[PDB]
Amino acid sequence: MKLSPREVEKLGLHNAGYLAQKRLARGVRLNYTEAVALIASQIMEYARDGEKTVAQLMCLGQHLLGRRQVLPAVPHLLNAVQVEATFPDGTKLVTVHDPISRENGELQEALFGSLLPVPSLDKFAETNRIPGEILCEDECLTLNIGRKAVILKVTSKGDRPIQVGSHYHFIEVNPYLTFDRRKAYGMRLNIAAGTAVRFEPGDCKSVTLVSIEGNKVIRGGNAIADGPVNETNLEAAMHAVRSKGFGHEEEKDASEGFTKEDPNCPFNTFIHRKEYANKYGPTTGDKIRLGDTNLLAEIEKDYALYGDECVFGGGKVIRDGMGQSCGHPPAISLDTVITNAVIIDYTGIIKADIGIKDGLIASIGKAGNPDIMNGVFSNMIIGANTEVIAGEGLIVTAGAIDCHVHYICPQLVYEAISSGITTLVGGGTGPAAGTRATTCTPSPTQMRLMLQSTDDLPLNFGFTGKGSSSKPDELHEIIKAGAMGLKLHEDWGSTPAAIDNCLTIAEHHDIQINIHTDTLNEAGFVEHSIAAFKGRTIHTYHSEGAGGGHAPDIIKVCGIKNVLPSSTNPTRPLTSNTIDEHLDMLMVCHHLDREIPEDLAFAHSRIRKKTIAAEDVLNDIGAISIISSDSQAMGRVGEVISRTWQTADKMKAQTGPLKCDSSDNDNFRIRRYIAKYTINPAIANGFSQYVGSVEVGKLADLVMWKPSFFGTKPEMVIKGGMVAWADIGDPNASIPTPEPVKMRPMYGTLGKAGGALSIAFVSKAALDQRVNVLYGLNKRVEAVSNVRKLTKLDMKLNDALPEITVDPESYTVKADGKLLCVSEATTVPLSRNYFLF
Amino acid sequence: MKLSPREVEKLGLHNAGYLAQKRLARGVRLNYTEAVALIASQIMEYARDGEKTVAQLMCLGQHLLGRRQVLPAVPHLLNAVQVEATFPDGTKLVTVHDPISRENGELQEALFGSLLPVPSLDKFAETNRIPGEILCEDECLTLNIGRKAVILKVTSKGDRPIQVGSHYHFIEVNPYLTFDRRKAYGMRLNIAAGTAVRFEPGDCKSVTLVSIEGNKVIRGGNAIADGPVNETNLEAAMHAVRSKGFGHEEEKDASEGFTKEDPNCPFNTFIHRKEYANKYGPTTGDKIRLGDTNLLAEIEKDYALYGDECVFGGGKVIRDGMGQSCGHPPAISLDTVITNAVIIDYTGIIKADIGIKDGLIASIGKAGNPDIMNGVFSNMIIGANTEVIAGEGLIVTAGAIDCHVHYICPQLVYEAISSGITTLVGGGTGPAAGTRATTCTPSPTQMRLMLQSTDDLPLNFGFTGKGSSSKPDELHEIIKAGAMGLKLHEDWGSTPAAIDNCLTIAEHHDIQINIHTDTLNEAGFVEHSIAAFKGRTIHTYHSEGAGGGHAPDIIKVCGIKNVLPSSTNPTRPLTSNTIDEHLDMLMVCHHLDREIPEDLAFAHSRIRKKTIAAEDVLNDIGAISIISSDSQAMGRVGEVISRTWQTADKMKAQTGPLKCDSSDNDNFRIRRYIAKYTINPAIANGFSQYVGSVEVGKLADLVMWKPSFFGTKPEMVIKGGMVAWADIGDPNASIPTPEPVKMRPMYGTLGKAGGALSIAFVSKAALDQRVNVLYGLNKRVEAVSNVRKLTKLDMKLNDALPEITVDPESYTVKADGKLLCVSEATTVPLSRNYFLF
Amino acid sequence: NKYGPTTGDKIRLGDTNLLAEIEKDYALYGDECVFGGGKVIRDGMGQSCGHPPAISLDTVITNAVIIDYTGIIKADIGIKDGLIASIGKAGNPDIMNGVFSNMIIGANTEVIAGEGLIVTAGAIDCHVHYICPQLVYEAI
Amino acid sequence: KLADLVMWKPSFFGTKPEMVIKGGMVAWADIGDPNASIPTPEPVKMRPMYGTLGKAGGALSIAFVSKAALDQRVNVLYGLNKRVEAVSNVRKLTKLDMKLNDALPEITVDPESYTVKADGKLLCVSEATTVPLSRNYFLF
Ligand code: NI
Ligand code: NI
């Protein structure tokens, strides 16, 4: 065969398209992935026939699928489909535009080549909301306010077309443009940023120019007016215009004035809010739908001055001397800048540019050129050494932190980073039996081996040891070796003696203690474990008890002040299929038999509907502060984020807005829930200063999202200022977009680069021992700290302390005397519109 | 499932076979890949049935497909199909020989197991050239000229057979062979090299022996006659023959004489030219078709003396004391040798052996043993520490250089090396928006990160910085950090001031400047950019301007002496589908709207049929010297080679042979076009002393091609004397050939070996700073040089300087006053016979 | 005495009878690069301020008498990245005439005073017997 | 075995070696003035040779550790350029394994007079007023 790599990936695309074809043939409404796969594969097959031209397939691709063959969200999620295909002329790109544009598609065209029976149009059932929509006001914003303005008359004496950008210095335009070059000094076109004005040969146009702001320094272009804006440089520029032969004709009666906040001012350029949001992303007061959920994030504020947005492209703002600063020290220029980004964080939902330098979030605010723009600080200068990432219409979020990973395989690392998790904390050594059940890395030899094996991966890593011992010796040994925490587990012995020993060791070493308590109640009930805590800080994994813990009342720990509670994802939210799944999964895990009464009694005592339904409310009100994975140990590493937002959606459906929220937006709920997997795990584990939020000085572990895909599939995962993972298409494509578009690893994953972008979190004892030198780790290594004085009040936005009471018989849960109960959710968002399987 | 790694690959093979089955069922004629996939998959399914023997499937595989179910080239491309399958008695290899041997195949057998409807034989349409054929003369070559010859009478007294090779010392043969051992001293069988004479037990034969040449030293065998050929050693050998009991019987009247250039001489052995070309590959005067193209490469000369070809195998020349030297220093022994290779290079098209030592091309000439052969120099000795690569009937070409790579993903690196590109020059940091448009690596941090990430890849790498600045500060900073060139780009500002600044910096630092001129004509027209050049050397990317540049007449730079122009592949050659593809590709790239008149006007001004037709003539006459990719930025990395040859084919179809060519061969055109991606990029970028040609002293970045597959899919890519990538079959196969045959990475890609075989090209400023030590690079690092005094006359075979004139209105292009116009090509070679998708 | 000999002067080489005459001098009289308290090489006077950081010399030997097989001259030697970056006149092109871009004294430039000293290329000894490592110290 | 050799002049045996070879390379040697025309002239001192410089001294030596430490690969943990080997065969040793010194006398010491008997015979040696290998050789 001699198959090249692109043939292999195209064969995978064809297999996905054939799966979509079978599903379409049996009459199900396809989702986004299936529709894209079908359209791409059918375009490839029609190209393989060789009886069509590229334009014919551009027209044909719009007829394959209609609105009735796809889910109601697909027409909004699916704007175009690029694909490469080998015609008789060779490989050609062909792109379908708005492929879903009819009520019904041509199903014979859609299933062509598959040799499957074409289904009748009746087979597609009938039953909406736009994922990622921007809800704007019906207002026209006004650009370039408080500036000196002049309306000039320009005529082209050239024989070729001449576009000029919005921020290009107008006195330095092509010499074959004739106009009053004296009145264009220190001026730029008063038009929307990133747009242009075109002068066809001989064309005559009346333009409006507004003064540049900032330091008012002209650089670049033709070097006609190289220098600050003043009278002497104006005379020098006019002498250069006359000498070098640049078109100049005085217009004595030109119109002069100022741009005002006036609808009837002749110098003002207006732009509708919808057009503004389409061009640069939403501004203050707009709202964003988070995926296909019911949550609306309103932009609390916006750092941009309208008219000076940093837009990169051909003939756009970020260019030499216009939006790329040129006359500044090389060493204050940003390494990277994410432009026009909507930042969702636990602190707020804002619109800003994120400047990244040396792998840290250098600044958040307005970027650009202080020579040309107002409001640009010295930590936000875009220089000639600055890479640009376009955040127009994308959401920037901090990389998620998963604090309950079982290192059972290295493929869960790829699955986690592909979903936007940049930090894993947990324990394990592989698929050994001890780590399938526990997040313990027992041996120091295994600690060294796991720190060495994960050294090249572009994630932050933290490993915990086995704290289930009644004497402190081996705990000291494993903390000294690199363990940043200890784990008490029922399978090693989670008795009160072990709890006391592990907690005094934690107070000695300033590490966090994770506990999975005794489900059998063999040494005592939950009150005796709480007594063993002795008021000391402790993190409780899966505090509900579905993952495990004192049957039935482990959930009482959500009311204790010194206990930091967390939840695992497989119960988030309660749904119709949750109990059967969890019961029989528990039976599989524990090798239990349904036919023996004791085994089924244990299973039913441990998997409880009422206590999970209470867990949902406790997550909503802030009594549970962290949502983790428990990966491959009753947990899914790639669903910490999505499941969290699903919970939020459910709690808006069945409880309405929170008290702090209103009918306008869901900003407080969004902040509370995004804190559960970004900042609260970081505070709990003791590395809050490095990761967990989009804050200046923190590591640049960022995740880009389309608002239509928020919570399911990110556009790219940036690790330490470099793109670690991203959605990319065919490597042999003419552009990056053509199918198959997969979440692939980028240059941040190769060589010794992935270690240069990330941190290995260890204990203070291990860093004092310089385990990064002993083990030969290329990664950065930092010590965890500030975890022993923590109470529930330190969890951001999740500091509630209800008085929990569980009935021993009926398992009814009351918080402050009020019953906690929520209905089962028959559906969830962020699941079915997005995933092939 | 517990799927082992081989089951996954066999499942992929089955998927490819099922795709081929669906295509065959709808009645298209399969290509090579589809036919191989179908035959292998069907053999696997018949084995899975368990009702067939291996012989039954050997016979059955020849009847699945006929000549009417496959393209006309497939019967010549497809000689056999090996496949490994699980029969009821375990895993067995079954291989089909000449699987296309009927007009029509058994379509029920071909589609067996798929449950698809068998198509009637009428559905396959009707419409020849042999890919890779060797056109030889009707002449018989004569072996071993000017040697002393004796015809002896040998008889076997053994009870089991004795086969003797062509170069084995005949006095050293099995003791049970009786013959005149005195007349066999210093003699070897006068037969074709690598062949043998078989003595069945009791068999009595008459053989002809000719003297060995060179130093005439006998080594190895039975150690009967070790030493130089003389009288004293003859007497010692005869004493050893008598003592050790070797069969000896004097033949007083044995015929003796000399081998002559005479057809009717009794001592001469003749071999036909077709048999010679089949056995050892073509010799002087033969012709080779390059793939399925129109082009015929004639062997200009051959370094081989007929009779002493270095052939490796069982009982063949390269053996201890016959073709493997024994009495030389271990150090002068070659590390490896490519034998009997046809070398296509811009210098010439020759037949030679390539000796590689320490990762460099140690020598080109005749390899072997100077003790036994004439014409072997001390830099071409095959010793006991020499690996052998068989170039018999294969073409060896220098690894291609792609000078316009956008480092958007690391998968394009695999795509490039799998197609024969060994050196990438360009810029980028990942899928950031700044690098999807430009080949700029802006930050020094990103320069370090990218040099570290590509440290283990087995390719040569060169990174360029962002030169679009009006002051030199950040340009100095990024050149000092590792950048070996700068890119001026319209997206950052490609104005005359930036051009002047970047060019004076280039003159300072001795790096090359690549430019993407201003398409908007915002600061100047093309004459003003040329004025900004000020006669200084500059590389111009995609000089035609489809990729971008001054609308419509950037192509005028092809006439400027100091400009080194290049073209990108997606316009190479003009075909019927090119304009629609490029128009709508530009529309998606620049986010343009077809319904806005200005946007469509810009798009039509940029994508022009007349200049895209002009660049074909300009590449043919040599006015365009380099063909690059522009990978994933309107460019395909894996088609730099194929597209180039496609253009050559087109320009032979529509213009005939060049002036320097004749009706016999196309050697000058082949050299001119192979210079466009091997040597000219190397000269332009400043590392032509290391890579870019099959020349002694250069790095051994070689690509071995089957002549039928030349230009599409190489047999292997050697990097620094080690096989970096190769076409290999199932890992669990009994031999390397069985399907699925994929181009896989070899041991050159693992560990710290990939860096040991490559060069990272940096600036002189960076090598003086020792960035290979600062960044911890295991790769070799060299400085680029000799790029500022270059003119068009330094590009090899592409030094033409036509006087170009473009019409402002009609876009008509004239070179020296003559209209340049080429017809659209409705088909191309090297595309459809070879690729699955 | 102040800056070292200029064109036409002569220097006795040690206590030998050999006189090295300065063949030529790159200095413009009045703009000698002298480092010290209240001297020429200062910010904005003889130390340049308005140039890229990366063209500044790493080191500059000032007012040096260079004896070499090519000639016996008087010049400043600019060193950058461990190589002899340039030989000529160092200083500030804002204030001084005859300063090229490879001879700019910036704020990242170390100064060695060659006033009245002779500069020679390090000798090459091609017949060393590596009998001990102490001869290396004696040689250097 | 490792080539840890010591070359002595027979007139100087036991006091001052001519050279100490470590792993086939001269580690230390008696050498004279570095600027002498030959190695012999005074002051002749025992000086360290090229075996003691750079990463050569580790290339010629062995760091003896336990088996537990070699299993842990402490040569990799600590970044040692020296060769590392495990000690072994020390638990089954008796007096009879010491070469040429395997005698086992029955020793008896008097508690009061400290008189020592071996196999019942008094052990007594006179004090030596002089020793060789001390005064003919050492300056101090
Ligand atoms: Ni757990
Ligand atoms: Ni370009």
Of B193, B188, B150, B148, nearest to B169 by C-alpha is B188
Q: Which helix (H) or strand (E) holds B649?
A: helix B640-653
Residue B169 annotated as lining a ligand binding site: no
Nearest Cα of chain C lies from the Cα of B777 at a distance, in angstroms, of: 20
- Cis before B745? omega within 30: no
Which residue among C133, C137, C138 places its CB closest to the CB of D50? Answer: C133
- Chain A residues touching residue B497 (CB < 8 angstroms): 219-223, 226, 320
Best D76, D77, D78, D80 member to test A by mutation, with max A CBs in 10 Å, is D77
Helix (H, G, I), strand (E, B) or coil at A56: helix
**In this structure, is the dihedral angle defined by the CA atoms of residues B200, B202, B206 and B211, taken in order, positive or negative?**
positive
Angle, CA of B500, B501 and B506, to the nearest 5°: 95
DSSP state of C16: S
* Strand pairing report for B296-298 and D25-31: unpaired
What would the two tokens of residue B196 be? 């043998």
3-state SS, residue A84: strand
Contacts of B220 (CB under 8 A, 6+ apart): B169, B172, B226, B320, B321, B322, B326
Q: Which residues of B are catalytic?
A: 590
Give the distance (Å) from ligand 1 centre to CA of residue A630. 6
Shortest CA distance from B444: residue in chain A? A385
Q: How many CA atoms lie within 13 A of A810 on its CB side?
A: 5
Ligand nearest to the CA of B426: 2
* Residues of A forming the active site: 590
| Closest listed residue to residue B453, CA positions, set A752, A139, C34, A735 | A752
Nearest neighbour of C81 by CB, restricted to B471, B472, B768: B768
Closest partner CB to A747 (pick from B16, B453, B776): B453
Which among A480, A774, A775 is the top mutation candidate for probing chain D, defined by the most D β-carbons within 10 Å of its own β-carbon? A774
Residue D6 CA neighbour count, 13 Å, CB half: 9
Inter-chain residue contact A775 with D79, CB threshold 8 Å: no
Distance CA A398, CA A674 (A): 9
Instruction: Report the alpha-carbon distance of residue A765 to residue A477 in Å, rounded.
Output: 10
Decide: A608 and A602 in contact? Cβ < 8 Å.
no
Alpha carbon of A515 to ligand 1 centroid (Å): 8
Verify whether the Cβ–Cβ distance C132 to D47 is below 8 Å.
Answer: yes
Could you tell me if B345 and B694 are in contact, meaning their C-beta atoms sit under 8 angstroms apart?
Answer: yes
**What SS3 string covers A571-610?**
HCCCECCHHHHHHHHHHHHCCCCCCCHHHHHHHHHHCCHH
Q: Which residues of D touch A (CB under 8 A)?
A: 72, 76-79
Cβ neighbors of B821 (< 8 A, separation 6 or more) are B610, B613, B614, B617
Residues with Cβ within 8 Å of residue B287, at least 6 apart in sequence: B134, B135, B296, B297, B298, B299, B664, B665
- Measuring CA to CA, which residue among A268, A328, A391 is closest to residue A694? A391
Residue C105 CB-density burial (10 A; 0-12 exposed, 13-18 middle, 19+ buried): buried
Find, in chain C, the residue whose alpha carbon is nearest to that of B767. C81
Task: Tell me if B577 sits within 8 A of A92, measured CB to CB.
Answer: yes
CA distances to B341, B397, B497, B696 from B718, in Å: 14, 10, 44, 16
Consult the annotation and say whether C129 binds a ligand: yes
Q: Reduced to 3 states, what is the DSSP secondary structure of residue A119?
A: coil
Check contact D-B (3+ Cβ pairs < 8 Å): no
Q: Please give the Cα distance from A621 to A804 (Å, whole number).
A: 13
In chain B, which residues are followed by a C-to-N distance beyond 2.5 Å, i.e. a gap?
127
Question: B599 among the known binding-site residues?
Answer: no
B to C CB pairs, distance under 8 Å: 19
Chain C hits for B768, CB-CB cut-off 8 Å, are 81-83
Name the residue among A484, A486, A444 with its Cα closest to residue A764.
A484
C-alpha of residue A610 to centroid of ligand 1, in Å = 21
Q: Kindly give the distance from the C-alpha atom of residue A94 to the centroid of ligand 2, in angstroms, as a whole number.
A: 21
Residue A450 tokens, joined: 């796991």
Q: Verify whether the Cβ–Cβ distance B443 to A313 is below 8 Å.
A: no
SS3 (DSSP) at B101:
coil
CA B472 distance to own-chain centroid: 42
Ligand showing the shortest atom-to-Cα distance for residue B549: 2
Q: Could you write out the DSSP letters of every residue in A456-520?
A: SSSSEEEEEEE---SSSHHHHHHHHTT-SEEEE-TTT---HHHHHHHHHHHHHHT-EEEE---TT
Chains in contact with B, counting 3 or more C-beta pairs less than 8 Å apart as contact: A, C
Gap from CA of A487 to ligand 1 centroid (Å): 9
Give the chains touching A; criterion: ≥3 Cβ pairs < 8 Å: B, C, D
C-beta atoms surrounding C85 within 10 Å: 18
- List CB contacts (< 8 A) between A451 and chain D: none
Between chains, do C133 and D39 touch, taking CB under 8 Å as contact?
no
Distance from the D84 Cα atom to the nearest Cα atom in chain A, whole angstroms: 17
What ligand has the least distance to the C-alpha of B488?
2
For residue A428, the distance in angstroms to the closest alpha carbon of chain D comes to: 20
Nearest CA in chain A to C54: A330
Q: Is B542 known as a binding-site position?
A: yes
HSE-CB at B79 with a 13 A cutoff on CA atoms is: 5
CA-to-CA dists, residue B526 to A582, B496, B532, B551, B617, angstroms: 70, 10, 10, 8, 21
Task: Residue B768: count other Cβ atoms within 10 Å of its Cβ.
Answer: 16
Known binding residue B630? Answer is yes
Instruction: Say which experimental method was used.
Output: cryo-EM
Instruction: Say if residue A552 is preceded by a cis peptide, omega within 30 of 0.
Output: yes
Distance A305 CA to ligand 2 centre (A): 31
Task: State the nearest Cα–Cα gap between C123 and chain D, in angstroms.
Answer: 16
A6 and B602 within 8 Å at the Cβ level: the answer is: no
Q: Are A748 and A414 in contact (CB under 8 A)?
A: no
B528 is known to lie in a ligand binding site: no
Interface of C with D (CB under 8 A): 130-135, 137-138
Structure tokens at A732: 């042999």
B488: CA distance to ligand 2 center in Å?
Answer: 9
Residues in Cβ contact with A29 at an 8 Å cutoff, skipping those fewer than 6 apart: A68, A69, A70, A71, A124, A125
Interface of A with C (CB under 8 A): 329-330
Number of the ligand closest to the Cα of B427: 2
Nearest to B398 by CA among B347, B462, B453: B347
The span from the CA of B340 to the CA of B354, in Å, is: 8
* Residue found by looking up tokens 């120099």 in the block: B377
C and D interact (at least 3 Cβ pairs within 8 A): yes
| CA of B567 relative to ligand 2 center, distance in Å | 10
- Find out whether B431 and A728 touch, Cβ atoms under 8 Å: yes
CA distance A118 to A25: 6
Whether the bond between B228 and the residue before it is cis, its omega within 30 degrees of 0, is no
DSSP string for B337-396: EEEEEEEEETTEEEEEEEEEETTEEEEEE--B-TTT-SS--TTSB--TT-EEEE-TT-EE
DSSP letter at A48?
H
Using a 10 angstrom Cβ sphere, with 0-12 exposed, 13-18 middle and 19 or more buried, the burial of residue A709 is buried
List of chain A residues whose C-beta atoms are within 8 Å of the C-beta of residue C52: 330
Token pair listed for A167: 């921020």
Among A760, A787, A764, which residue's Cα sits nearest to residue A775? Answer: A760
Lookup: tokens for B312: 């490796």
Contact in structure between B478 and B446 (CB atoms under 8 Å): no
Q: Which of A761, A727, A744, A736 is CA-nearest to residue A834?
A: A727
What are the structure tokens assigned to C80, written together? 């950058």
User: In C, which residues are within 8 Å of A329 by CB distance?
Assistant: 53
Residues of A in contact with D76 (CB under 8 A): 776
Half-sphere exposure of residue A472, counting CA atoms within 13 Å on the CB side? Answer: 12
Query: What residues contact A699, with CB distance under 8 A and at least 6 apart?
Result: A359, A360, A361, A460, A690, A691, A720, A759
Domains of chain A: 4-124 (3.30.280.10), 133-143+269-398+698-750 (2.30.40.10), 147-259 (2.10.150.10), 399-686+751-825 (3.20.20.140)
